[PDB]
Symmetry: C3
């Protein structure tokens, strides 16, 4: 099957669901209305996620695994960038 990971924040709430499918991770988003496709699109067969609020600003870390290599992807409001995580 496809593999998913989920995070949420606040009380509305905001939800982000990540799906690993055919070597690619994509993102679906809800913020109190309908679902929409998120900006996140990077390779992976396995995915985990965690998020935290710095005041009103959400920060997301997505851990994308292909073989024995896990790449950390960072959302800090402006774009998805590679993090310094190593195994």
């Amino acid at each position: 099957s496809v593999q998913t990971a989920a995070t949420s924040w606040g009380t509305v709430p905001s939800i982000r669901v990540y799906t690993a499918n055919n070597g690619k991770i994509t993102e679906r988003c809800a913020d109190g209305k309908g679902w929409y496709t998120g900006a996140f699109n990077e390779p992976g067969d396995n995915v985990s996620v965690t998020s935290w609020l710095v005041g009103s600003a959400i920060h997301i870390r997505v851990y994308a695994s292909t073989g024995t290599t896990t790449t950390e992807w960072c959302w800090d409001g402006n774009g998805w960038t590679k993090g310094a995580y190593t195994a």
Copy 2:
């Protein structure tokens, strides 16, 4: 090969929910500050993820159950498990 689990918790007691995908079936184990018991959640799936949030003292849980390329969202809001609006 092995079962696949997802976990969420809330408050300081705490309350914990663990979801296990086992040979195409997802079941739920629960702790609320005593022992473990089997929860009301039972739906098909080979893969499960979960998130939860509090509105005051009221827990809201979203479980994402996947079979092949089809992900179904299940919603706990205090009364029972309902299918959610999630699509992909």
Copy 3:
């Protein structure tokens, strides 16, 4: 492919990433000044994690699965101990 589970707490933040690799689950840690190897080391092919704060004290529960047997490991400030979880 390796399988990961991620949790975070606070606003720095603190992040823990658990990786199941060839029947071994290991832990990588970030507390605001780089990644280091954590004290968690247990057998398993699948891992999930949840954590919560009681005031300023962090508690972690890691669910490690081999076949159909899931073992819960507990961090409560001092060390990793066997939890009461069964299925």
